[PDB]
Amino acid sequence: PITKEEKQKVIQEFARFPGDTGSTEVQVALLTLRINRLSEHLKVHKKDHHSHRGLLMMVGQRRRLLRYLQREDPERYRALIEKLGIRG
């Protein structure tokens, strides 16, 4: 799967402050991570519809956060989706 180390690296890279876990950017980034990994999975396993539901849920989850983040601070939003290359 996705390892403990790799997750740590993402978290520390988007953490707003030294200990920061669960902030929006960290959440969006963790989701962005899972999303992209699943996307690749589904490209090969087109017939795994059940996991695709998982993908929709993650996408849904990230969407809400980004609306929130963009509601609060447009600046951190624009920089986050750019840092992740997300809009489209």
Q: Note the residues at the interface with RNA (CB under 7 A).
A: 1-2, 4, 7-8, 11, 16-17, 19-24, 27, 34-35, 37-39, 41-59, 63-65, 68, 72, 86, 88
- The DSSP letter of residue 85 is T
What contacts 11, CB < 8 A, 6 or more positions away? 21, 26, 29, 30
Least Å from the CB of residue 59 to RNA:
4
**Which one of Mg ion, RNA, none is in contact with 49 (Cβ closer than 5 to 8 A by kind)?**
RNA
- Please report how the helices 4-14 and 24-44 are oriented relative to each other, as an axis angle in degrees rounded to 10: 140
> Which of the choices RNA, Mg ion, none does residue 14 contact, using the CB cut-off of 5 to 8 A by kind?
none
42 vs 83 by CB, closer to RNA: 42
Shortest CB 82 distance to RNA, Å: 13
Cβ contacts of 32 within 8 Å, gap of 6 or more: 62, 84, 86
Cα–Cα distance, 45 to 24 (Å, whole number): 30
The residues of the shown chain that bind Mg ion, judged by CB under 5 A, are 66
